[PDB]
Amino acid sequence: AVLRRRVVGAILMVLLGKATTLALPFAYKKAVDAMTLGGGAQPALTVALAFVLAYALGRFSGVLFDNLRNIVFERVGQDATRHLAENVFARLHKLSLRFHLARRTGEVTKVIERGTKSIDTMLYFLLFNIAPTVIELTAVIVIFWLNFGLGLVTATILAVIAYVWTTRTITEWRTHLREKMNRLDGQALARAVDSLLNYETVKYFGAESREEARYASAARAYADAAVKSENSLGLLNIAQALIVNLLMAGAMAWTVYGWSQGKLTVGDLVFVNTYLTQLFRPLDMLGMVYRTIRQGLIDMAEMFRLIDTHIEVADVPNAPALVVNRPSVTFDNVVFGYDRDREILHGLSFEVAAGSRVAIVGPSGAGKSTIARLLFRFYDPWEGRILIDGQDIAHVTQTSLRAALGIVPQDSVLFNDTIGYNIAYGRDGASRAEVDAAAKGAAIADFIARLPQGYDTEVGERGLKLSGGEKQRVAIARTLVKNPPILLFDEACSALDTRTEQDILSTMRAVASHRTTISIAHRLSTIADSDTILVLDQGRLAEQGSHLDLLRRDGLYAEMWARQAAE
């Protein structure tokens, strides 16, 4: 390590923490060492100064060592928290698409925050509690063993065994309550966040009172659970305090039975009572430490089980890269369903040669966007296989496949940033020439120009500050900056007017020559000039061929095109 000297200094400060509980009994030992009127004339000032120094300097050194070890350890602790956060973020982005589609934001946020905070406190308390408490208790047991007190050490170890057994049982009880408390907290936050994401929906339907009521129910449930958990905590604390105070009372009774008025040895009475006043804290701390360790272990196990769920899409060991010389797309008996109970895509097989401009039309919910998701290997198909340039998709690394094609999604999402940043996100470090070329290609050059502070205009969350047509155009500009050999369009021009769509199609036909392009849309006025059209229905390829051919065959595509041309 590079900061090993830092943790060494922290451990040294911990060891120096022993100095306060070492100097505390020294005052009593020096005072009782003098029997009566110890140092009457001259050493009276000396013993007074010894008392003052011991007390004040010991307490000050204890607090000073605590704050100094905290200050020196802050850097290491925050670096550990930052590394943990980065790795959590990374592994979170590595998760599958089914998760991010069916997730609940509030519960995940609560679990992640609880895991981070609890693991940090674990990392602190391990080295700050386990070592000093063990050292202190062992030193006390050794001091009591070297003395004539033999029943003392046996009673102490038996009482500590009873203490840890009771702490274990009540900690199991507290864990039982904490599970319900955490469940209710997660549900309450998830309900609130979902209510907040549907703000426009709530306002459209005027159901603010209903959202408030449901969140209130979740919150009062969580409040009751927390009250019960804290009462169990208080019960554990009073049981631990009972055991500790009974041990201290027994030690005091033994030391008074030794000699009522006097003391057995010089140090015995004072040393024992001062060590009880110093030892009531480690015994109270050990139960809290066991509780914190148990709870942190269970919550970190929950987080790492939720995070390390096997990602559905995983590259084969020593998988090659996707080499695209002639970009073709082939589906070979591809059968897929999102869940096992509903088969979405049935036996589907089709071919898309290089340089072709192919269309995929069909009814609502027939699985065209499913074809788009499968081509990008978001889900592995049940049967059959997908091929790009005669190469299987699953048998190739995800990185090369996903970089070799650029898809415009049906519902686009934009970063809360300027239009310029969103457009330049297409490729890392995009030159302004590429950005301007994509803006002119996507029909936003005139629009951004007419905007005040145009390229720096904020688009808001998910790009909702822009219009539908503008958002679609920005998505097309991103995918144009990416410049893939295969450019997929998923209902991109649904919000655009016909003029902008005609302009952008003319641009694409004017420049794009070597790209294989597949487009899926419902308004058939946009794809009637495609090379071939695929009519998809109930997840099966029903018709395939040119627009004129499909219109002459008097099939489903001809029916849909006659239905659209009706006024």
Ligand X SMILES: Nc1ncnc2c1ncn2[C@@H]1O[C@H](COP(=O)(O)OP(=O)(O)OP(=O)(O)O)[C@@H](O)[C@H]1O
Binding site for ligand X (CB under 6 A): 101, 338-339, 344, 364-370, 410, 465-470, 495, 497
Tell me if 176 is assigned to a ligand binding site. yes
Residue 552 as a binder of its own copies (CB under 8 A): the answer is no
Find out whether 174 is annotated in a ligand binding site: yes
Annotated binding-site residue? 237: yes
Q: What DSSP assignment string belongs to 512-524?
A: --S-EEEEE-S-T
Which parts of 239-268 interact with its own copies (CB under 8 A)? 241-242, 245-246, 248-249, 252-253, 256, 260-261
Residue 565 in contact with its own copies, rule: CB under 8 A: yes
The CB-of-67 to ligand X minimum distance in angstroms stands at: 50
Binding residues for its own copies restricted to 462-521, rule: CB under 8 A: 462, 464-465, 467-470, 473, 478-479, 482, 491, 494-500, 502
CB atoms within 10 A of CB 23: 16
Does 38 appear as a known binding residue? no
Binder of residue 507, out of ligand X, its own copies, none (CB less than 5 to 8 A by kind) = none
Pick what 411 binds: its own copies, ligand X, none; C-beta below 5 to 8 Å, kind-dependent: its own copies
Pick from 223, 285, 288, 306: which binds its own copies (CB under 8 A)?
Answer: 223
Distance (Å, whole) CA 357 – CA 376:
18
3 state SS of 551: helix
- For residue 410, say whether it is annotated as part of any ligand binding site: no
**Closest Cα partner for 367 from 338, 393, 341, 394?**
338
Q: Is 514 exposed, middle or buried (0-12, 13-18, 19+ CB in 10 A)?
A: exposed
- Could you say whether residue 452 binds its own copies (CB under 8 A)? yes
- The token duo for 378 is 């978001």
Q: How far is the CB of 146 from its own copies (least distance, A)?
A: 25
Cβ 489 to ligand X shortest distance, Å: 12
Selected from 414, 435, 438, 477, the binder of its own copies by CB under 8 A is: 414
Q: How far is the CB of 336 from its own copies (least distance, A)?
A: 15
Beta bridge partners of residue 535, listed in sequence order: 361, 543
DSSP per position, 122-145? HHHHIIIIIHHHHHHHHHHHHHHH
Q: What's the Cα-to-Cα distance from 409 to each of 188, 317, 473, 493, rounded to whole Å?
A: 32, 30, 12, 11
Residue 517 burial (CB count, 10 A)? 21
**Cα of 116 vs its chain's centroid, Å:** 8
Q: How many CB atoms sit inside 10 A of residue 118's CB?
A: 18
Q: Is there binding between residue 207 and its own copies (CB under 8 A)?
A: yes
| C-alpha to C-alpha distance for 148 and 135, rounded to whole angstroms | 22
Helices (H), 34-149: 43-52, 58-93, 97-102, 105-125, 131-146
362 belongs to an annotated ligand binding site: yes
Instruction: Determine, following the binding rule CB under 8 A, whether residue 563 of this chain makes contact with its own copies.
Output: yes
Contact flag: residue 402 with its own copies (CB under 8 A): yes
Who's near 347: CB < 8 A, 6+ residues apart?
333, 334, 335, 384, 540
**Of these, 138, 309, 399, 431, which contacts its own copies (CB under 8 A)?**
399
Which part of the chain contacts its own copies (CB under 8 A), choosing from 13-21, 58-66, 315-323, 346-354? 58-66
Q: Any known ligand binding at 285?
A: yes
Residue 133 labelled as part of a binding site = no
Q: Which of residues 324-353 bind its own copies (CB under 8 A)?
A: 338, 341-342
Report how far residue 49's alpha carbon sits from residue 55's, in angstroms, rounded to the nearest whole number. Answer: 10
The closest residue (CB) to ligand X is 469
Stretch that binds its own copies, among 2-10, 14-22, 302-310, 407-415 (CB under 8 A): 407-415
Q: Of these, 201, 349, 431, 506, which contacts its own copies (CB under 8 A)?
A: 201
Shortest distance in whole angstroms from residue 202 CB to its own copies: 7
Q: Which residues are annotated as a binding site for ATP?
A: 338, 362-373
